[model samples]
Target: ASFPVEILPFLYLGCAKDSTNLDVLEEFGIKYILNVTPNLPNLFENAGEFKYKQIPISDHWSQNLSQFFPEAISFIDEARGKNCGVLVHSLAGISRSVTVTVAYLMQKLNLSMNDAYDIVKMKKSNISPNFNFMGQLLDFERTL
Candidate 1:
């Protein structure tokens, strides 16, 4: 379905395709978006009500989501701080999206990397952030 799954009241995880659905976004009260794929154009960039912070990354071992964690964390935090819902999405909502969301959880929620990884995968069973990204997250945890 690619429907956004609520990882927290203001945080959702989903696929890039699902980001185009106005209805789904409405239901979730999504006001901010974290578009995790570089080439996946923002569907409603000029829609007037939505804010976006595109994390220019590919789902590749060579690419680094860890580098963008600073921005991702802040963008999502800004959304939740404003009491607005933020949706994080990659091409499939499986790897890239999960990685960024997990990153947010570890810092904002005071969760360990595994616990952060656990909750997202538990919410959406198909999620599996690629190995390289997971490795970065391991290092990210130590930065705490």
Candidate 2:
């Protein structure tokens, strides 16, 4: 918290269910919401005018990979272009959101899936990716 903003490598915003902690966002000037849930705004009404984008991914990590990948990639592209950054969340922020977030980071960092996952696990002791998607990504990596 002491370093200059430029010194911040990259700030990741991952949330559990329904746009985690609006207060922190309100404090940090969060400009967008990347909703990965099927529903809209379970709580926190009339969220201030900052652009909320929803690309609903399934709650289950083991669901259809074909459906999630394209949507997730599009969402990440949107986030990168916006530059203001986004708060990523599904119903729990652990599986779905974590998968998309880490996958995008891996794309950005040009790191392998195993490497990206290891980095994330180091930050959060008990982290895991969407199992089916993880397998898909492993297969996808082999093709690359």
Candidate 3:
């Protein structure tokens, strides 16, 4: 494996651009990949070996990304429950993917938006979801 990055216990937030090393993923015991980018090529070549799901949306606030929260949470939670790792990735690993991870934390642990963001930021320090995504996160916060 050429490049390897730090990963969280049950979930990992990563950049699609850095996903060149399939061996590294295997070594980390990553069993599922939840790709948030719109048109990136699939990294998991073997379907049976690696579970995969694509949300297929560009990094834009105008898009109703909150609609996919249920699916995202489901995938991550299911993978973790099975003692498998789930990789959530977007183009840059900062905005879209971070947003989804925060949302999942909010649902899974009942944390507020800011609280969830702080937790994810500790692991992926460079994460900064765009303003539009932040707005949606606020809306999600109110729902809780």
Candidate 4:
């Protein structure tokens, strides 16, 4: 039952459990996994069936999450370019995962913060990024 929420054609937002759920991940053909946490395991990484990137950032206010936006977005974009699904996940799929998913939409689709966030929220109703991350996404919007 741990399935990921698709934010766009190839981008997905999920939680820690969803990452380890082969039934869910395999059904979606998700081969690229973007883990936005400091401690979550990449369950299928050793097998090399899935490409993995760990952000090494926690869901804390002081963390400079935006600093890793370029790397995160690039990883996600790579999946889209290859016509593969990419999952961006955090422990709860609320703050950390939501932030990166919104950031990608903003940069890739040239969407404003509100629009990007709304798109994700509509697909995944439980999203709520930390207030600090909210601001970072706004800053990211302006640059795009």
Clashing pairs in 2: 17-91
Residue-level lDDT of model 1, residues 31-84, one tens digit each, is 897777755543435356788666556655576668888888998999899988
Where is model 3 more than 4 Å wrong at Cα?
1-8, 39-48, 58-61
In candidate 1, position 140 carries an lDDT of: 95
Task: Count clashing residue pairs in model 4.
Answer: 0
* Candidate 2, poorest ten consecutive residues by summed lDDT: 1-10
lDDT over C-alpha atoms for residue 107 of model 2: 67
Q: Per-residue lDDT tens digits of candidate 4, residues 1-144?
A: 557888888888886656467666778988898878755433334335788777667545576889889988998999989989998887654677788888999999889989988888888786555665778888888788
**lDDT of all predictions:** 0.78, 0.55, 0.75, 0.79
lDDT string for model 3 (1-144, tens) is 123234457787776556545777788888888888865543434466688787656545467878889988998999999988888876664577778888999988899999988887776676445666878899988888
Against the hidden true structure, what lDDT does model 4 obtain? 0.79
TM-score of each: 0.84, 0.65, 0.83, 0.85
Weakest ten-residue segment in model 1 by summed lDDT: 38-47
TM-score (C-alpha, index-matched) for candidate 1: 0.84
Candidates 2 and 3 compared: the better one by lDDT is 3
Q: Native-vs-model 3 lDDT?
A: 0.75
lDDT for residue 122 in candidate 3, whole number 0-100: 78
Instruction: Give residue 42's error in model 1 in angstroms.
Output: 11
Q: Would you list the rank order by TM-score, best first?
A: 4, 1, 3, 2
